[PDB]
Design a protein around this ligand. Structure first.
Ligand SMILES: CC(=O)N[C@H]1[C@H](O[C@H]2[C@H](O[C@H](C)C(=O)N[C@@H](C)C(=O)N[C@H](CCC(=O)N[C@@H](CCC[C@@H](N)C(=O)O)C(=O)N[C@H](C)C(=O)O)C(=O)O)[C@@H](NC(C)=O)[C@@H]3OC[C@H]2O3)O[C@H](CO)[C@@H](O)[C@@H]1O
Ligand SMILES: *C(=O)[C@@H](C(C)=O)[C@@H]1C[C@H](SCNCN)[C@@H](C(=O)O)N1
Length: 349
């Protein structure tokens, strides 16, 4: 009589819902397979045209018992079998969020970023659950910026024209301490032109190169000796036509001798610490000459609008020869400052 097998065992508990459930017949074919929960409600499934295999086709629930009934028929007669199992019971759930967004074109410095809404106790599990495909294929690695957010990138800047596909398959995965993913997420993005803007404190010029060729030179005024602009590699983030930077958000009042409420135009963010390339009509005389800022890359209004218009998320700004230190690797936009042996060795433990 037909031989029935299933991907789950009768009486199992803690069965993970990261995978469909399947049933196979040998020495015959499946006539029908049904899988029901404890209220009698069927799980969607599909029988192969040949009749040799069946699978669930929709996500299974947490904390559920399921009963699986299968009948097979062959040139030996029939067999009908039944099994029940119980799925994982999470202590807690987290939902991942992945950047950059689906369909976007980004620059050559843009990492994959997966942020969870809860602390991740088993970083290795989260990594293994995240599948990144690249075309052309390129080696990269995971590194945690904090307890919630993991980044992935290659050793070198991405090559333009690279397709990146990201499947965060965290549904049904135990991410440590009984914390399971609430649901999978996907995204797909493309790497565009190589755009690297270099600000050299010896020239006070910000030179924007596309694919190695100069397209723009901007006089700049970067951070005063006292509040210097850090050297290193910065990843371009968000852009704002207009933004208000306000002392008293931290707790220094506007009406204090270090207070300010500054209207700023054409502002392209390049570190979570607060470095922007923006419009600085008030320091155009100092641009190309003398550092005057709190550590933003001050350029002229129309140079700032050019940057806002022509630089995208993931492009790169490199600062060199200033009196600051180096941008932290875990700034949020400072990933490329971590040397490759360290980045690749990761910090999953
Ligand atoms: N091991 C667990 C199982 O093992 C493997 C799994 O194979 C399992 C163990 C398997 O299903 N073994 C067969 C022999 C089996 O247990 N079949 C039962 C028959 C249960 C039974 O003992 N019935 C008898 C009924 C007749 C006698 C008596 N028991 C009665 O009816 O009272 C069924 O599907 O209902 C594989 N098959 C897939 C994916 O389809 C796959 O590769 C690794 C793993 O998953 O997981
Ligand atoms: C740039 O040097 C500054 C101004 C007033 O032009 C700059 C904007 C940022 S705020 C963004 N995040 C909060 N820190 C800060 C800075 O520290 O650079 N001041």
């Amino acid at each position: 009589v037909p031989k029935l097998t299933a991907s789950v065992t009768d009486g199992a508990v803690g069965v993970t819902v990261d995978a469909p459930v399947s049933v196979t017949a040998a020495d015959g074919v499946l006539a029908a397979v049904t899988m029901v929960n404890d209220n009698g409600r069927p799980v969607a499934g599909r029988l192969s045209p040949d009749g040799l295999r069946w699978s669930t086709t929709e996500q299974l629930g947490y904390n559920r018992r399921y009963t699986l009934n299968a009948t097979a028929l062959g040139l030996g007669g029939a067999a009908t079998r039944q099994l029940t199992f119980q799925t994982s019971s999470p202590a807690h759930l987290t939902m991942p969020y992945v950047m950059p967004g689906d369909g976007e074109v980004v620059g050559v410095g843009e990492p994959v970023a997966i942020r969870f809404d809860e602390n991740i106790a088993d970083r290795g599990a989260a990594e293994k659950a995240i599948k990144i495909t690249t075309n052309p294929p390129v080696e990269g690695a995971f590194y945690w910026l904090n307890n919630r957010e993991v980044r992935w990138r290659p050793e070198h800047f991405w090559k333009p024209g690279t397709a990146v596909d990201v499947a965060v398959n965290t549904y049904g995965v135990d991410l440590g301490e009984g914390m399971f993913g609430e649901d999978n997420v996907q995204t797909h993005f493309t790497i565009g032109d190589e755009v690297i803007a270099t600000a050299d404190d010896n020239t006070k010029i910000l030179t924007v190169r596309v694919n190695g060729e100069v397209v723009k030179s901007m006089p700049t005024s970067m951070g005063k000796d006292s509040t210097p602009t850090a050297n290193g590699i910065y990843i371009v983030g968000s852009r704002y036509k207009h933004i208000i930077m306000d002392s008293s958000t931290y707790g220094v009042p506007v009406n204090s001798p270090n207070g300010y409420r500054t209207d700023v135009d054409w502002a392209t963010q390049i570190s979570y610490s607060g470095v922007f390339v923006h419009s600085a009509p008030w320091s155009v005389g100092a641009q190309g000459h003398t550092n005057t800022s709190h550590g933003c890359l001050n350029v002229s209004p129309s140079n700032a609008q050019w940057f806002y218009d022509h630089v995208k998320r993931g492009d790169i700004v490199e600062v060199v020869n200033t009196v600051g230190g180096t941008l932290p690797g875990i700034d949020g936009l400072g990933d490329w400052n971590i040397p490759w042996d360290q980045w690749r060795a990761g910090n999953a433990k």
